[PDB]
Design a protein around this ligand. Sequence first.
Ligand SMILES: *c1nnc(-c2ccc(Cl)cc2)o1
Ligand SMILES: *c1nnc(-c2ccc(Cl)cc2)o1
Lengths: 301, 301
Amino acid sequence: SGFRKMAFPSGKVEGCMVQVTCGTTTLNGLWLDDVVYCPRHVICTSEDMLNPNYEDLLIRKSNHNFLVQAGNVQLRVIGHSMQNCVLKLKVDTANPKTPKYKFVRIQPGQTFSVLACYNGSPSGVYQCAMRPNFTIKGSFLNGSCGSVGFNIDYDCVSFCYMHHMELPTGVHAGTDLEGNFYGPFVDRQTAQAAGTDTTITVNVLAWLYAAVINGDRWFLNRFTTTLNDFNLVAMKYNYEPLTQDHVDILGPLSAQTGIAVLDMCASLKELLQNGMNGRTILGSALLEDEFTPFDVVRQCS
Amino acid sequence: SGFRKMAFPSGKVEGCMVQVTCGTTTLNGLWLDDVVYCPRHVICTSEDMLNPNYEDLLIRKSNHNFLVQAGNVQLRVIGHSMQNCVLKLKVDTANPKTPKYKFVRIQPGQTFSVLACYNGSPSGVYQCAMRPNFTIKGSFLNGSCGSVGFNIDYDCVSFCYMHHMELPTGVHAGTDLEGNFYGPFVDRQTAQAAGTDTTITVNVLAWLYAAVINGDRWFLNRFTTTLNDFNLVAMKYNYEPLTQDHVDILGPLSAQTGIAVLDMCASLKELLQNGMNGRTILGSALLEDEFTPFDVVRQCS
Ligand SMILES: *c1nnc(-c2ccc(Cl)cc2)o1
Ligand SMILES: *c1nnc(-c2ccc(Cl)cc2)o1
């Protein structure tokens, strides 16, 4: 038994992490097939960051100005293009370690593993969730630029996130592997602020179900409630409004434990109105919102 | 910035995970050079688990009874021996992916990354700490047997843990890579119970220092205290007694933040006597004990 915050094995993504340098900017790149994907911040200097014209900054760049270094193997750039906020550097050698991959744009609430890299070398791996305000709460220092977020399902590596910025809030914002930012964030040192970070309600319910499977069952109540009356309490405590699609996905969890979803919603309603009274659920004194219903069934199979 | 529960990149360990089967038992093995390390539980049946004679159970086994399968590549067993509670199966092919490795026996308080495997295939990776009672709090289902714990320092993979059992407490017990269990645990379905799980005091202090670096500084108090008077409160709340070796290791952390170690001990003393008053430190409502002083400086460099 046991239940932990678990990240996918990062081996298949390590073999794709490289080091990209252009001018004075050096960051991490993603080497898939014969293309190296990196944030377009690589072509910018610390002065033109309040409002950079990335188009004009790229017209003065050419293939020989981009330095891609895989470990120590240096790749020959034979092309370059700017797709939204990422740069696609066509190299001469295809990565012999390129896995089965796809580019996914996840929805707010889904999770992914982040392989933090510095100058092309992997440093650590941790699990993150796309918050409702399209931000993430991770660990990114100077040089973590180009670090990717991914899910590995069976044999396909579904890349979904590439790290770009850290907001003044300490939270992090990034793009999909096609260059489009998650949320209303631009790659400029302008006045950017994330909205209300609500709580992913369906993920908390899945985490409560994982607690029943691992022993902690004290929060199980003798009440029940309706979907509208629970969304009443959910809105007052700034929780995501629960939908019927959310109830349907929690079906398998409600079937193994034999606890209806709405009976679990009443337990969450009591936990939001009365707190935990100094107790813990799965070793935490807070309500966990980074486990999707799939994350629980994966770790409980 | 940011600070997360981070695990080492598991790529170098994935290339060493294999599947071992003997008789009816199938578990995971560690393929380093031309030897496959696996728990000796592999030679046992579900009846002789109250008190198995592993010696006699092995005299009826031979090299052809052990089935090692790396992915689908099957290895030829040319030797076998029992070192304490692990089995060393000499194979014919050396692993082409064998990294720089060493066998380490860690001390209570140190951390390591666990690569959870099922039937030789990696499933997830998470960080664990060797609790003071020589147990760990991880996630191990049926088939996680032989899963290893490791630290990767620079280029050397320091294997330190191999998973064996789950106690009735839900906690987990295992051995070093030489077969010796951590603590007074035997590989028998006998009456086994872990002792008092105290709190690693020096790790909590390092985590409080990481909070000051990442913004959360409300717990910083205007008091101070002595080492003996803090150990007074530490013992009452079942904390590990703080030593001067502990104070010396936190030196670098006290130098960057400009906060003396004993001034931080007074803040922890107030947090143990008055709680958190509904607040959070680094996003947690509890006191975190799985970050060593090295884990903080690694994630803050
Ligand atoms: C790493 N990669 N991109 C960045 C970045 C982009 C825009 C701004 Cl305003 C700051 C940092 O950092
Ligand atoms: C996996 N590997 N070893 C074991 C085990 C050993 C002893 C006992 Cl009593 C239970 C399980 O599981």
